[PDB]
């Protein structure tokens, strides 16, 4: 008997209520407040140029057809009431394939205050496009966007605003980072306008600024490349009579550099330019190849000009270690400054 | 002023027969299509397909939906699209496709006072196209999207590109990492099946592959191994273990690259333009090891002739390979 009071209120509100018409149709612009709570910033995929994010996506607007007076100022109702009234048709402009979770029930809430204000939040897993400029890979940073607005209503009908000051209208949970090789420095919150073949629409934008962590690639690629270059220059110290021994040094290091060069683009998308890692491998290849060319020079002059052959070997013991050291000073200083 | 809109809309749907097309049993209904391409990605040779996201719009007049007294274009909730007649357009070469549904179904219905309906959907589709890889990786591809009506023939429906050559937009903003759209084209025609003749609209792109990736990954590793095998001609011919180790390693490595490259491609039965290079590079490193075997077999009885062969190979082998590069890179470009 006690809930029959709220049964009458809910039945009264929906009596003659048309959910096909936006609030204030033909009279004013429907203003929708929005904020996002990021529960977990998911992994970033360099191969697909995308990223995943889990959000509590909250929306709020005023509908005067849903004003009531009764025992409670706020009705915390079931989420199936959302399908009975008008809700904004918000979509993500750069979204790829998102999920509106409904386990064990549709993860939505709907709260109606006595003045008609509606609060309507839902839990989503958004997978959004994030184009990347991989010229400075693996020392690169990216600004991954997240844009959303109405799908059918132009800015003369529905507009979106941030609930609070824009910097504080997107909040990231402290423990939610699901990032492996990236670091979330911060996010910037903005608002735009798009003009399509159907009209002008308001777009709400967020940019997440991610900087990649180079630690994995130092172990996986840079350290093997450096040790291969050093390993090939050990051949300069073997005596000139070890022709089979110095050849095996030369060939096995060259073969190794080819394997490392091929294996270093497995994760990356197929791009037509050279990254910062491709320049390191190419130069390290030049040092390994030039150490074998030096041996063929020393081996060519043996038994004919022994004095010159010793001269070449003595200088290579200094020039090769010094040049490779200077190259690393220039390489790391050039890219770690940015 | 708002209860009048509800009264007007409820009057239209009252008695509305969704089972009947506009002008049923009369002149064909004309439907105009606009496409607003959002992104193209996942151009795969393994699966012989590509993925396309677009804003797909259809435009037609239904006299049963004409209203008066409201000087507005009624933009209704997308759930009203389940009560009106819409064309049964499908994509013939479509393997997988979905309409995005976050936060609601990405769908737009917008009526006009004269009865015109604008119906827009945001569609991601994985269309199919067969790629001729005989010139891979220096090849061009032509991947299309076919648009057709399933049930209604040309006696019932007509398709035209709304806006002529400007019907499809958004192509110039696409940046595929591995390709580049040379040109897009729009075609209108009729297709005859056993059950009748149906209209069709075809949208086609011409993609030209970028070779910059394959220089680093495939061509340069092959060229450097071939140069590596010419060091053997500057080593003394009595150093057998040294020159055999150099000759053997290059030959087996050259085989390894070719096998590795074929892993990530469809099991096509023809020879691609990259295989002719790898097979051509294999012959040079195989003739380099085959050359030493002749010197080693002959340098005992005729040591003078063995020295000459090593000195002539230092010129012929670099010259022949560069001549091979000249013929290869001029036939395929």
């Amino acid at each position, epitope marked *: 008997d006690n809930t029959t009071v709220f049964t009458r209120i809910l039945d009264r509100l929906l009596d003659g209520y048309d959910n096909r018409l936006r609030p204030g149709l033909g009279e004013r612009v429907t203003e929708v407040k929005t904020d996002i709570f990021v529960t977990s910033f998911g992994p970033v995929s360099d191969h697909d140029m995308e990223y995943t994010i889990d959000v509590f996506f909250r929306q709020s607007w005023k509908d005067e057809r849903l004003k009531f007076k009764g025992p409670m100022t706020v009705l915390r109702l079931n989420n199936l009431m959302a399908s009975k009234i008008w809700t904004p048709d918000t979509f993500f402009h750069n979204g790829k394939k998102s999920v509106a979770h409904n386990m064990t029930m549709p993860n939505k809430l709907l709260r109606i205050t006595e003045d008609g204000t509606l609060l309507y939040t839902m839990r989503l897993t958004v997978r959004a496009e994030c184009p990347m400029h991989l010229e400075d890979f693996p020392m690169d940073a990216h600004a991954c966007p997240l844009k959303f607005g109405s799908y059918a209503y132009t800015r003369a009908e529905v507009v979106y605003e941030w609930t609070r000051e824009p910097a504080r209208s997107v909040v990231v949970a402290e423990d939610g980072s699901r990032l492996n090789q990236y670091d979330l420095l911060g996010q910037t919150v903005d608002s735009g*306008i798009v003009q399509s073949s159907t009209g002008e629409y308001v777009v709400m934008t967020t940019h997440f600024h991610l900087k990649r962590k180079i630690g994995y690639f130092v172990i996986q690629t840079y350290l093997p490349c450096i040790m291969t270059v050093i390993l090939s220059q050990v051949s300069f110290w073997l005596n000139r009579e070890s022709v089979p021994a110095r050849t095996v040094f030369g060939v096995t290091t060259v073969l190794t550099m080819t394997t490392l060069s091929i294996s270093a683009r497995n994760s990356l998308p197929k791009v037509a330019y050279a990254t910062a890692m491709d320049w390191f491998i190419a130069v390290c290849y030049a040092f390994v190849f030039s150490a074998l060319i030096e041996f063929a020079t020393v081996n060519y002059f043996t038994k004919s000009q022994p004095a010159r052959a010793a001269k070449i070997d003595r200088l290579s013991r200094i020039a090769f270690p010094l040049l490779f050291g200077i190259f690393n000073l220039v390489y790391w200083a050039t890219y770690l400054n940015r | 002023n708002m209860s009048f809109v509800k009264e007007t809309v409820d009057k239209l749907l009252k008695g509305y027969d969704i089972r009947l097309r506009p002008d049923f049993g009369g002149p064909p209904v004309c439907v105009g299509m606009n496409i607003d391409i959002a992104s193209i990605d996942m151009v795969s040779e393994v699966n012989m397909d590509y993925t396309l996201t677009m804003y797909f719009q259809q435009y037609w007049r239904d006299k049963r939906l004409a209203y008066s007294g409201i000087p507005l274009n009624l933009t209704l909730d997308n759930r009203v699209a389940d009560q009106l007649w819409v064309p049964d357009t499908y994509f013939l070469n479509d393997k997988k496709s979905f309409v995005h549904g976050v936060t609601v179904k990405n769908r737009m219905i917008r009526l006009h006072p004269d009865g015109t309906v604008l119906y827009g959907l945001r569609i991601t589709t994985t269309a199919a196209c067969m790629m001729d890889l005989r010139r891979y990786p220096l090849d061009e591809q032509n991947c299309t999207l076919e648009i057709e009506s399933y049930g209604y023939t040309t006696d019932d429906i007509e398709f035209y590109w709304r806006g002529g050559d400007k019907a499809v937009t958004g192509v110039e903003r696409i940046e595929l990492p591995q390709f580049s759209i040379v040109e897009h084209r729009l075609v209108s025609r009729n297709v005859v099946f056993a059950t009748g003749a149906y209209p069709r609209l075809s949208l086609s792109f011409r993609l030209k592959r970028n070779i910059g990736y394959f220089i680093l990954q495939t061509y340069m590793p092959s060229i450097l191994i071939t140069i590596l095998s010419w060091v053997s001609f500057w080593i003394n011919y009595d150093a057998s273990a040294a020159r055999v180790a150099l000759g053997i390693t290059t030959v087996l490595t050259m085989t390894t690259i070719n096998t590795h490259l074929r892993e990530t491609l469809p099991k096509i039965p023809y020879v691609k333009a990259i295989d002719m290079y790898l097979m051509g590079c294999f012959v040079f490193v195989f003739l380099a090891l085959l050359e030493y075997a002749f010197v080693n077999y002959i340098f005992f009885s005729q040591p003078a002739r063995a020295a000459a062969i090593d000195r002539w190979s230092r010129i012929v082998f670099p010259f022949t390979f560069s001549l091979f590069n000249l013929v290869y890179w001029l036939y395929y470009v």
Partner: nanobody
Amino acid sequence: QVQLQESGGGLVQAGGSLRVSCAASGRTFTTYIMAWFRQAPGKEREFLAAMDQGRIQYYGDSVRGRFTISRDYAKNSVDLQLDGLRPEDTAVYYCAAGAGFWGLRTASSYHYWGQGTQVTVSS
């Protein structure tokens, strides 16, 4: 080399359209953000308008509703349309392009800059 060259501009009298155009060469900027900045003499370099690959338009508050930014992706150009100009709008206008790291409204996030065009409003 990558250069942003800016044409248009000039002198106008108390309002009136003055379209300013920027031509980019040496690199395809389809995936970048091309913006417009203004620097009045001695005040600061100020953000005016930007547009990214998805045709989204961003404007500064002082110029929102007056200046319209457009991009021509086939020609790798961005054009800004100045309307209702005022003597306060007399400055040098700069063309920029970047990836918008730490904010599309910050001049430190654009790695490519033009040389500027003089726009003088006489009234």
